[PDB]
Design a protein around this ligand. Structure first.
Ligand SMILES: NCc1ccnc(N)c1
Ligand SMILES: NCc1ccnc(N)c1
Ligand SMILES: NCc1ccnc(N)c1
Ligand SMILES: NCc1ccnc(N)c1
Lengths: 133, 133
């Protein structure tokens, strides 16, 4: 009955959007283990761009989040069939918002969609602070 | 054996410092319920000063934190003996960093000290972003 869910990401400056996404992945089935992968500094810079917090800082914040059961830090940038078998992962939870490399997961019945929440990012709150001066 | 711990605070723009403090309060005894109080917007402004996030925003983030068992939102600004009895609270966890109104708790054996962690605040990270331009 226990289902292993994997979600990966940068988790830079963790905000309520990340946390709601993690909650959604945790709650995809009644009984889950949610494994979170945290991307390396070098690979995040190479493929996505700047990152504000180091791998160690992004990983430490994640350990305080209720929905996170296990952490792979750092995690590989691209998910592979071999990775799923190594960690006995039953489903990969993704927002399907580009960053379709995941078609093979959908084909296999192993893709579970999650959503984002806008207007909650750390960035947006400095904007809220500054719109008082 | 279960001990009810109460920690209150603003919890504005929650960062790793808050989370480590909550972890410390949760882990003060083997078996605890950690109740977190979140201060009202009006009282935080009157007594401490500006607050960036609303009560609802600060409370929602807290529900995602692993160590938080129950939330009183909003909570009273000053802890009273009557409040401890109403909620069956065994100890109040505070950093003892001023903001001694807590002498009566120390007298009663109900004060448990927790510590802060500097350099982790949301504020500090924009400073880290800006020191690249
Ligand atoms: N490692 C995959 C990945 C990378 C960046 N952002 C994501 N959401 C997922
Ligand atoms: N940066 C990833 C992410 C996750 C959830 N919500 C967002 N708005 C963004
Ligand atoms: N409600 C008490 C209080 C108010 C502000 N900051 C704290 N840490 C505690
Ligand atoms: N603002 C309260 C607080 C809690 C923990 N650590 C800090 N540095 C500050």
């Amino acid at each position: 009955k226990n289902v292993v869910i994997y979600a990966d990401g940068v988790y830079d400056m963790l905000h309520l959007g990340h946390m709601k996404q993690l909650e959604q992945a945790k709650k995809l089935f009644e009984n889950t283990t949610l494994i979170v992968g945290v991307t390396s500094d070098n690979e995040t810079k190479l493929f996505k761009g700047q990152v504000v917090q180091t791998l160690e800082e992004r990983t430490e914040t994640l350990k305080h989040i209720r929905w996170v059961d296990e952490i792979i830090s750092p995690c590989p940038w691209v998910v592979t069939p071999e990775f799923l078998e190594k960690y006995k992962i039953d489903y990969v939870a993704h927002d399907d918002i580009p960053y379709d490399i995941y078609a093979w997961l959908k084909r296999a019945g192993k893709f579970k969609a999650t959503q984002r929440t806008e207007g909650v990012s750390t960035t947006d709150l400095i904007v809220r602070i500054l719109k008082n001066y």
